[PDB]
Design a protein around this nucleic acid. Structure first.
Ligand SMILES: Nc1ncnc2c1ncn2[C@@H]1O[C@H](COP(=O)(O)OP(=O)(O)O)[C@@H](O)[C@H]1O
Ligand SMILES: Nc1ncnc2c1ncn2[C@@H]1O[C@H](COP(=O)(O)OP(=O)(O)O)[C@@H](O)[C@H]1O
Ligand code: ALF
Ligand code: ALF
Ligand SMILES: [Zn+2]
Ligand SMILES: [Zn+2]
Lengths: 686, 686
RNA sequence: CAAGCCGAGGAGAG
RNA sequence: CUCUCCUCGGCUUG
RNA sequence: CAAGCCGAGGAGAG
RNA sequence: CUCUCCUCGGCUUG
């Protein structure tokens, strides 16, 4: 209910009715400023007897829920009506009179965008920006290119231009709400010179229609006293050992490569090798030539294992290989539950003729890992010095890496002795080759991390922003560097004086250089903002108008082309990737809800096999996987109206046309230019 | 970390603070001397508590990356901060505080030149030479005329002259860094007498501000014992056969020539013929008279084929012709996808009425090639004598030649039997009529050549310098002689005792004489250096000062004229070269980023045809070629802001003016004196 | 809690 | 422009 | 990985 | 001074 002088100095111009942006460090009380501004604006509008509505837009459901339940509701419930929406709630069914029913709204931009789309094209009641008097946008740095924030503000700018036109012609013009953006680091984007950073900042300002930035410039000492930066540390690790297992991997790779008389132009263990393997497997699948598709797939698996070994223990890679190979053996045995294919035979024999030696080599404390030893030392020093008063975050690139680090931590008793309780955290996307984490589990782990029964976190890029996390004492980056904004957000985590920020990496990689470049970009952005804050109003307004007009017109020009697919379902046929054979046509495939592709015919039922659901394995089995006779996966099982149907994935097939047959693969249904009919139950019924 | 006595004797004067040059053979440890000198200089400056910064300038990104990752970083990382920059990295965004952040810098001269230009004219922070204490320039022989090295050292000399002036007037003068140049052969340039070589060496010294040369003069025996020169061999090949195919080429050439009643003043198969053909085609295109432009173009193609045959197999020339003719037929058929032009008709018929006989003649082991037989014998003898312990390099003039040699090698089983694994290597410039090689592929082939799975290389002038190559046993020059410096660099490749250097050529050409002249220049340069090393300091300094003053003043005088183009876009019109017709005007042409010329109008869209991208052909097609109705190419396709636009090449057009119309062709946009407007999306929009 | 569909952003390699 | 990795949002069948 | 722009150096022929 | 061949660097659109 009360603000600090450094908060007040930045908030004042907003209190005067000027739309602006506010860039403050992490944890400096931006939400406090937002709530105070909303209260003041509502009171001032009520004094004049004018309609007052305020809407807050965020990009995460968890953020909206937290802000409503902890910050906004407890402060304005006594005076105004507050509501918080998201995609997980049932209030969004009728949004327009959600709006007129309540005064303060917190939500995600997509809901309001959908309402606008319904109004402009749909027959629903719809909603307009004029219904609002104040719009708050947190994490405003995301307003770029064609994000939802950018679309909303594009509509706002179009309305502003229409009002400017109407100024000379009929009056009055359409009123527009005030705009308040919140952030900590707007970034520089792809900037290689100071002028590029200046242009990027001006573009952000024009997109958000900002009068100025209002960065702290007077109470710097008080702010620094309060929020204090950690000390930065670099850990560099080098090695010229760990030969045996890697050499064994390399020589088996050479054996498999010379089996197919294919010597790639690239070396082993690099992304270029993976790309070449993907290209070769794709070409082999298109041509239907076996003995190369599987070879490329196994080479890709070996490359992934080598990368994993380059980052973490050898047992992790061994586990990866054994999981893949055991799955293949189980699939083959289930199919055989006879003619074999020699290629899979020699591949399996090669893997199993050296499984024991690989396992023996993997267990060798002689050369385990330099980076892991450095991380062990860092964690132990920090925690032993904190006398049980420390908390830590570790940012890592991948998910399997998080699992490996967590289990590794639990296998060592020193972490428990010092009092270390670690947990992992990942995203919620089903497009990462691994079972994602659910929102409930994320909130739940965050809650226990807040309590303290969990000491340290092993998190992917989820944890930089949008999460309510108590200040930690140690921040670690395990070979992960993305950009300056993520760097700043991770750095701001290290409050709790006597906290430190460390980046651990090796010499071969260029991670340190990327971190340095991010630092350079930080200073470039600071200088750009410093210059921009002192620019003359006239030229500032001129350039903002120019940028807004250019953005709107280029959006118009780009949308012009988007108007643009012949429908010949019977023209195409589907072939299994490994065993090229006629699977089905485009006539037997039907669509449910225009979204689910399913084939429901008698003969097709006997062309596949059903397995158990591994996700539910670790009860009942509902969505079983679908595998081919060769062992190739086609899709899964679904139930519609209580009826069991198969759902297919286009990426598991090859398309053949009857006109000229340039067989092609589309990776998803939408890219397929042909249409499919909606389900008709008359076929194979009554 | 430790030096040899011959290295020490040359390094000592540098250790005393004297700027100098150092000329040593190839592979004698120049980088070792450089790193030791940098370490000693940094330590000595730190002893006196003085600012110390060292910058190394190179001319190739690969060289900088290699030097940083293999030589400098592993030796000074334990004491000093080392950084390596290039045009392929993101650290160059803010160079000045790259400089103050780090102590040791490795980079390409262009970056520092750009920083200086920004400081002197731009508003950026900028950089000055005074910020450095030591400047190392490798491959210093390139510092001549107006290379980047020469510009930097011109600035250095101007600063020195200003300091000399200020000596009598206000003091102190501006400090300057020490200068250390590295090379192996500074060369003689265009020298025809000993005095000319002396003048050239003095000019190089003055440009680099060198106290002396410091060439090895005492430990000659130890150096010779270590690095040993190969034995030089000349292979001369003569022939009075291979008539049929060449005579058939000549008689078809005569037929086409007498079709147009044009008997050139020159003979067939010489550069003078190609020049005359280019002049005739240019005049015909300017006059718009068809039946001569295409005739000249086909005559030029036949001349190129005859040259190729003069160097390599006949099938290579046959492939060249069939590629061109098949492309023409495909273009015509795609256009027709009707009125024909009799000229192309009889040309095509003439080509196709003898395709089979040409193919039959090309396959004839009776007379294949004398030079190729000699090369076969040389390679076989070397490799059979090396019992699988040899590596080889072959320097060839052109790229198609490298491809032909490589494929020829793979067609013969004797090379495989002896254990020969060959690979090719070319440059990375898109101005050689052939798709260039990329940097990644160059590094990658070099890596495998280092490993050994690739035995011999077929390389153009890329491989003489700037590449990390393990010593080879055989060096071959296949009819290629450029200058003494390239000769010395190629010769130095032949370490690995029992290595040999051979030049293969015929009697008609004057290649042997050019090689002999290069040897003469080598001895002339040696004598010039020997005299210069013994010159009296006073006259040496006097002449160096005179040369520096003369160079700076002539640069001033030349820059004076460079101050100097009316803008009448609507004045000109563009005509297709083959079919002279109104294509467009200078008003419908717009410019993107001041660099890309594009025409975006409705009527223009229907005036051209789109083909597939051959580079991507051997997926998706993004930059398709643009062809005319007559089959003439105009340009390609580009995408800006997601919008498909055509990009035109001026060399495919003829310019017509409305005042007096002296139609002219410019070969590139910059030479065109008129300006063009920047893209404005308002036209044909909204 | 499981399956599927669409769209968006960031990094790296080519 | 392509591939990979990572994140986010909305929508359906259960 | 594709396209385009600018500039520099070396050789040969004229 | 012109033409061709070869090499290099920097910068944009993707
Ligand atoms: N007026 C205030 N006086 C004292 N502490 C405050 C005040 N406002 C906020 N804080 C502190 O700041 C924290 C809230 O910061 P918050 O706004 O959530 O961070 P951010 O601005 O980075 O989102 C609270 O934990 C609280 O301790
Ligand atoms: N002090 C030394 N003792 C022994 N060998 C050395 C020494 N310094 C360099 N070398 C040899 O010289 C090579 C490095 O030469 P380098 O300086 O790269 O060649 P150049 O001077 O032609 O660039 C290495 O392969 C190494 O074997
Ligand atoms: F918005 Al913050 F830490 F910067 F919650
Ligand atoms: F500089 Al060298 F061989 F002469 F690398
Ligand atoms: Zn199958
Ligand atoms: Zn034409």
């Amino acid at each position: 209910l009360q603000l600090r002088p450094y908060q007040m100095e930045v908030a004042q111009p907003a209190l005067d009715g000027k739309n602006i942006i506010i860039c403050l460090p992490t944890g400096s009380g931006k939400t406090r400023v937002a709530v105070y501004i909303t209260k003041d604006h509502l009171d001032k509008k009520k004094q004049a007897s004018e309609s007052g509505k305020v809407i807050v837009l965020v990009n995460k459901v968890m953020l909206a829920e937290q802000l409503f339940r902890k910050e906004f509701n407890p402060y304005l419930k006594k005076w105004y009506r507050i509501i918080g929406l998201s995609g997980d709630t049932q209030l969004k069914i009728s949004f327009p009179e959600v709006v007129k029913s309540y005064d303060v709204i917190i939500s995600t931009a997509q809901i309001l965008e959908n309402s606008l789309l319904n109004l402009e094209s749909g027959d629903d009641d719809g909603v307009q920006l004029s219904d609002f008097s104040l719009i708050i946008i947190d994490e405003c740095h995301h307003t770029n290119k064609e994000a939802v924030y950018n679309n909303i503000m594009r509509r706002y700018l179009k309305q502003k231009l229409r009002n400017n036109d109407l100024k000379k012609q009929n009056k009055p013009a359409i009123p527009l709400p005030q705009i308040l953006g919140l952030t900590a680091s707007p970034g520089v984007g792809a900037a290689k010179k100071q002028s590029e950073a200046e242009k990027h900042i001006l573009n952000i300002c024009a997109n958000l229609d900002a009068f100025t930035i209002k960065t702290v410039k007077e109470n710097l000492g008080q702010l620094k006293h309060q929020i204090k930066e950690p000390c930065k540390k670099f850990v560099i690790a080098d090695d010229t050992r760990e030969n045996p297992f890697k050499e064994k991997l390399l020589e088996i790779m050479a054996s498999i490569q010379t089996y197919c008389q294919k010597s790639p132009m690239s070396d082993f263990g690099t992304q270029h090798y993976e790309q070449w393997a993907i290209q070769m497997e794709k070409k082999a699948a298109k041509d239907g030539n076996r003995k190369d598709r599987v070879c490329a797939e196994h080479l890709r698996k070996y490359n992934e294992a080598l990368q994993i070994n380059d980052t973490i223990r050898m047992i992790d890679a061994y586990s990866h290989l054994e999981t893949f190979y055991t799955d293949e053996k189980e699939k083959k045995f289930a199919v055989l539950n006879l003619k074999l294919d020699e290629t899979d035979e020699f591949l399996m024999n090669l893997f199993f003729d050296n499984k024991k030696m690989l396992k023996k080599l993997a267990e060798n404390p002689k050369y385990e890992n330099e980076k892991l030893i450095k991380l062990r030392n860092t964690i132990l020093e920090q925690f032993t010095r904190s006398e049980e008063s420390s908390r830590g975050i570790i940012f890592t690139k991948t998910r399997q890496s998080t699992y490996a680090l967590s289990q590794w931590i639990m296998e060592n008793a020193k972490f428990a002795e010092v009092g270390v309780k670690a947990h992992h955290l990942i995203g919620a996307g089903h497009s990462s080759e691994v079972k994602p984490m659910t929102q409930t589990e994320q909130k739940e782990v965050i809650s226990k991390f807040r309590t303290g029964e969990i000491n340290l976190l092993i998190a992917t890029t989820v944890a930089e922003e949008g999460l309510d996390i108590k200040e930690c004492n140690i921040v670690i980056r395990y070979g992960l560097v993305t950009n300056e904004i993520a760097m700043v957000q991770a750095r701001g985590r290290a409050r709790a004086d006597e906290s430190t920020y460390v980046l651990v990496t090796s010499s071969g990689s260029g991670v340190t250089e990327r971190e340095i470049v991010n630092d350079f970009r930080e200073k470039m952005m600071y200088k750009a903002i410093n210059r921009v804050q002192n620019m003359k109003p006239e030229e500032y307004a001129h350039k903002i108008l120019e940028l807004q007009v250019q953005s709107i017109l280029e959006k118009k020009m780009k949308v012009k082309r988007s108007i643009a697919y012949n429908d010949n379902p019977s023209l195409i046929t589907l072939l299994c990737k490994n065993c090229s054979m006629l699977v089905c046509s485009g006539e037997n495939i039907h669509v449910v809800e225009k979204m689910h592709h399913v084939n429901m015919t008698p003969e097709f039922k006997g062309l596949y096999i059903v397995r158990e659901n591994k996700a539910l394995q670790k009860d009942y089995q509902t969505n079983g996987e679908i595998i081919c006779k060769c062992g190739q996966a086609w899709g899964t099982m679904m139930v519609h109206k209580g009826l069991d149907l198969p759902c297919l994935k286009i990426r598991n097939f090859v398309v053949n046309f009857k006109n000229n047959s340039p067989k092609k693969q589309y990776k998803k249904w939408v890219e397929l230019p042909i249409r499919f009919p909606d389900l008709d139950y008359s076929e194979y019924c009554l």
